[PDB]
Design a protein around this nucleic acid. Sequence first.
RNA 1: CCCGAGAAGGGAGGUGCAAAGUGCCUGAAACCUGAUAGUGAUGGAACGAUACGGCAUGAAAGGAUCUCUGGCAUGAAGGAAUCAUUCGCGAGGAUGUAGUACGAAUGUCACUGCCAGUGUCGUAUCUUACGUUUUGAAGAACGGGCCAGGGAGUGUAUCUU
RNA 2: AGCUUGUAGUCCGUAAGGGAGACAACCCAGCCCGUGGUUAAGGUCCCCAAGUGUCGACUAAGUGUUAAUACUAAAGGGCGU
RNA 3: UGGGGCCCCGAAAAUUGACGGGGCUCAAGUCGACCACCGAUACCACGGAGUACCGCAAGGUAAUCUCGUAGGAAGGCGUUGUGUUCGGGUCGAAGCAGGGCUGUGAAGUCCUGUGGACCGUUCACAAACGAAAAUCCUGGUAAUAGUAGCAGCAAAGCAGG
RNA 4: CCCUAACUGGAGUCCGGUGAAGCUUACAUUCUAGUGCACAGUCUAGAGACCUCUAGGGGGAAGUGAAGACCCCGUGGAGC
Lengths: 51, 138, 132
Amino acid sequence: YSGMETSARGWGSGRGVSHVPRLVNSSRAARVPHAKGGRRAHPPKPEADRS
Amino acid sequence: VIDAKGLILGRLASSVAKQLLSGDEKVYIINAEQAIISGSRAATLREYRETRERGATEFGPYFPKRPDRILKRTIRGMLPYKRARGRDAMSRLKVYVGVPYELKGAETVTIPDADMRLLSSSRYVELGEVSQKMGSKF
Amino acid sequence: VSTLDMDPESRRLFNVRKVQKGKKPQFKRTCSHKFKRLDDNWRRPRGSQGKQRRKYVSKGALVQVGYGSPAAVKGLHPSGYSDVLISSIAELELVDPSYEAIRIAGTIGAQKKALILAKAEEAGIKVLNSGR
RNA sequence: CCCGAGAAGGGAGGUGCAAAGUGCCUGAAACCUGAUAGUGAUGGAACGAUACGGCAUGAAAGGAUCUCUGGCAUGAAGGAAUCAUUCGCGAGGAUGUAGUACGAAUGUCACUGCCAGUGUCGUAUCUUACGUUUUGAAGAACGGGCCAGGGAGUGUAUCUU
RNA sequence: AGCUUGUAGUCCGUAAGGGAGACAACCCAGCCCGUGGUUAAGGUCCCCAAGUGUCGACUAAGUGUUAAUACUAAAGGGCGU
RNA sequence: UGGGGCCCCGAAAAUUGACGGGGCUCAAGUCGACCACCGAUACCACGGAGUACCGCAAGGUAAUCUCGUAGGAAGGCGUUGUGUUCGGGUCGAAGCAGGGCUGUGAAGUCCUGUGGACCGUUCACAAACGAAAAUCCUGGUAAUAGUAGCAGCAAAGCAGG
RNA sequence: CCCUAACUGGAGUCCGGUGAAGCUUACAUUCUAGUGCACAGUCUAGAGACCUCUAGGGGGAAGUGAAGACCCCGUGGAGC
């Protein structure tokens, strides 16, 4: 769950900000691959088979 | 030094503008009040009072009143006066009502193709008449 | 100093390439002069409405293979020699000085560069980057 | 050591291969301060491209039959001027001169010390940004103040080729 | 109706460059790069490269100086010419 | 009296404005014809690039090849690492600012300065591999701007030391 | 209100100190008409316009604030 153990949710429209999920008690964006500290989109998987 | 007496306004303007754009001379035009505008007097006066009273004359077009300045404006309309070339051309042109004292006795020229006796009718007025009916003192 | 081996056909193509490359445009990315965030390198225009993609002549030339230099003199140094990048002393033996000039690698130290210069000057090989 | 109210700070002077001078390795851009080059208080705007000029620079990495300026030879397409004759109401046409002189360029010989490039400004022509939604975008349609960094077709299983 | 819905061709969409003041689709033209020449459309009084071009007439109204286009006013009348 | 050309009346709109503008009257308008010229990247000529097909190769052919959105196909550039070949670096690696050259280009290389210890290269193989956009995210920082505010509270301080 | 005038204190105005924020792709001294997705400072043709600064009310920038709460659509929801 790297970059994903947050409960961040979007603010929605009507605030002048992107619709990305934010921390419940701050404006810092979370959990999305283009957010700082967010998860890697399409990372290497330990379950991948390279044999 | 071109004598504008009995000359078509637009044709004299075209000749002088093309000479100025050929750009080796200073042109002086005298007796600008004596230039001719073909067409009926009523129509010419109507169009010229329309142009004089047209614009947003507080902050719009400013059509001149003197006949020499009107002729200068007419030549200006046939020049790239917003360009450096047209600015030099208009700077090298001087127009006079009658003959200025310094040019008095100087040798003048006339454009044969601008002569008013090539007109086919008598439907014409003079630029001086137009100016004085628009209210210019000269 | 040994004269270039450039036959008259190669001389004519070299001068043709000189003239044509004097006219080739710089091929900067479109609108690179308007934003400092953009580099000068070339990117193919992509937008449907882009004037440079539509090839408006006023917007500057697009990158096309028609601008390629003549194939006989392609890659030659403007002096007429063939540029050969020498990364060590052992590469000087594979170069013949008749039409080839060596460019010593920029990171070569002074101690080895002096030896490389001595070997090149004994072999007669022209050098593009020496200390003069 | 000097200045400074100073246990601030600055100057001078040292240490160290190098100030690297304590949130101190390297030290970009945005932004801000100053200097230098160009321009500039009569001037018109997608901030540029192309050609030609003024000014500055042009040490290295670019050129030395290279740059400049001419001569000579050959020269594709094209191709005069002038004059003679003739036709046409006329503007002009036809024939000859003449496929001649010239002509992209290709060679060659002299002459020259600059040229390429770079910055800015000027003259000429062109161009109403970019991405997107759109039949239609310069739009008074949506997005970005700016800059740096991050930011999007990946793995397992299975089928097909 | 610059409306809506068909059909044939061609275009824009995805089409440069040249010309129409500008013009998605109107005219020439489909366009690798450089140089020279001659043309197309259109233009030749100036702005603007080239005609103040020739011949024969008309128009006196600044009418007009507007290929196509939805960007150009009708019926009727005139012993105007 | 009939049939025709051009013009006139019919003909009134809102900011000052539209033959593109100036202007133009045996025209610079209209009609019927004509002459010369200007004017594209069209066409011709030369040179060059790429492409298609053919050819063992050398090379040959292209008037019948060269615009392009969605989209398909081919070949390349770059980042980081692995195996492997061959190297560079304190006589100054990477990075950074600016510049020269090459290449259609992705980019590569070199020069000057700065920097102080690491960096490339052959043939292959991989990917957490390329950003200008997402009212994108994080950080830094402008214009706004020395501007608004520092005014109802509530008579708010003055003299001398 | 006809129909406004004078005056009082606080702001404002000018000076010292302190010191933010919000609109912003760029450029930008504009005005008229046309054109253009038929509501242009930037296109086209004209007309104007020497630059800088201060004060002032808000014509315009279809000004800013905000993924229209009206209408429709979505085999999207919620309650009743």
